[PDB]
Amino acid sequence: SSPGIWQLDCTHLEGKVILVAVHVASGYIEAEVIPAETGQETAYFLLKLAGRWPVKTIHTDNGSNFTGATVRAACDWAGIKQEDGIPYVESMNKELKKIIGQVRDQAEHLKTAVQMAVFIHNKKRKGGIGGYSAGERIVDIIATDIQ
Amino acid sequence: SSPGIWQLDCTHLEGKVILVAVHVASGYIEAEVIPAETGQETAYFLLKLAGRWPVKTIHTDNGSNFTGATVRAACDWAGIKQEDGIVESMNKELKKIIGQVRDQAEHLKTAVQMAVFIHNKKRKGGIGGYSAGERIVDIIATDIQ
Ligand SMILES: [Cl-]
Ligand SMILES: [Cl-]
């Protein structure tokens, strides 16, 4: 259920393609620059995500890199179901882009900045006492679901 | 035991370099093929790991890709401390699983992720048993408080 639901969208910066996976219930993110927006590279990214978190369902934009039997085969193999797409990334790709822009000049290559931004986003809280970061929220949700 | 303790080791296959990070207490793995065993690529891999899990300390082989200011600056920036350093049972397995699925993948990188998936989803001892994936989350969940 909610524990295994992720949204996958693409973002573009400096002629590069970035795939962003958001764990809906927590706001937690996994993002990476990929060589091209193809089924082969999208399948690779999804297989990487699935081996790190319990991915059960994904909501994508259902674009071209999903019509090929590549991504379909990967989702099949990993036990991932593809459902309804994203509406029309909302305040995520922009937010992630915001952090990236803020730290872009601190890294030589874009890939490093992307990861610095993912780190900042997932460790971000919302006040003292509790607050809870997206990183803590995802772990709590999955923990209190597998037990 | 080890809330944010990870071991980072390198492995080589088909003329390529793979970085393997093992969460000591759970056995959970994060591994990827990197373009070269350099400080710049090692720092990249560590930053990626650090943004996905609460990494506090890493045990590495303290080799050449750790003498450069690159990895030191990355650990510093992420708040990671480098300690003693080199499990072996989790690593060796990775190569075996990779060998069992290499044929299904066009590129090695894909086979590696397939292997990571299989390893982290592996059930402890059938029924009631726990996978490394479930163990790492349960460990960090109880640590948050
Ligand atoms: Cl996409
Ligand atoms: Cl290494």
Curated annotation (Swiss-Prot), chain A:
* Listed result of changing residue 89 to A: No effect on infectivity
| Location in or out of the cell | Virion; Host nucleus; Host cytoplasm
Q: What is the effect of changing residue 68 to A?
A: No effect on infectivity
Which sites bind Mg(2+) 3?
Answer: 9, 61, 90
User: In terms of domain of life, where is this protein from?
Assistant: Viruses
Q: Where does the Integrase catalytic domain lie? A: 1-142
Effect seen on changing residue 80 to P: Complete loss of integrase activity in vivo
State what this protein does: Catalyzes viral DNA integration into the host chromosome, by performing a series of DNA cutting and joining reactions. This enzyme activity takes place after virion entry into a cell and reverse transcription of the RNA genome in dsDNA. The first step in the integration process is 3' processing. This step requires a complex comprising the viral genome, matrix protein, Vpr and integrase. This complex is called the pre-integration complex (PIC). The integrase protein removes 2 nucleotides from each 3' end of the viral DNA, leaving recessed CA OH's at the 3' ends.
- Print the domain comment field: The core domain contains the D-x(n)-D-x(35)-E motif, named for the phylogenetically conserved glutamic acid and aspartic acid residues and the invariant 35 amino acid spacing between the second and third acidic residues. Each acidic residue of the D,D(35)E motif is independently essential for the 3'-processing and strand transfer activities of purified integrase protein.
Quaternary structure, per UniProt, is:
Homotetramer; may further associate as a homohexadecamer. Part of the pre-integration complex (PIC) which is composed of viral genome, matrix protein, Vpr and integrase. Interacts with human SMARCB1/INI1 and human PSIP1/LEDGF isoform 1. Interacts with human KPNA3; this interaction might play a role in nuclear import of the pre-. integration complex. Interacts with human NUP153; this interaction might play a role in nuclear import of the pre-integration complex.
This protein's name: Integrase
Q: Write down the species.
A: Human immunodeficiency virus type 1 group M subtype B (isolate HXB2)
- Lineage of the source organism? Viruses, Riboviria, Pararnavirae, Artverviricota, Revtraviricetes
Supply the gene name. gag-pol
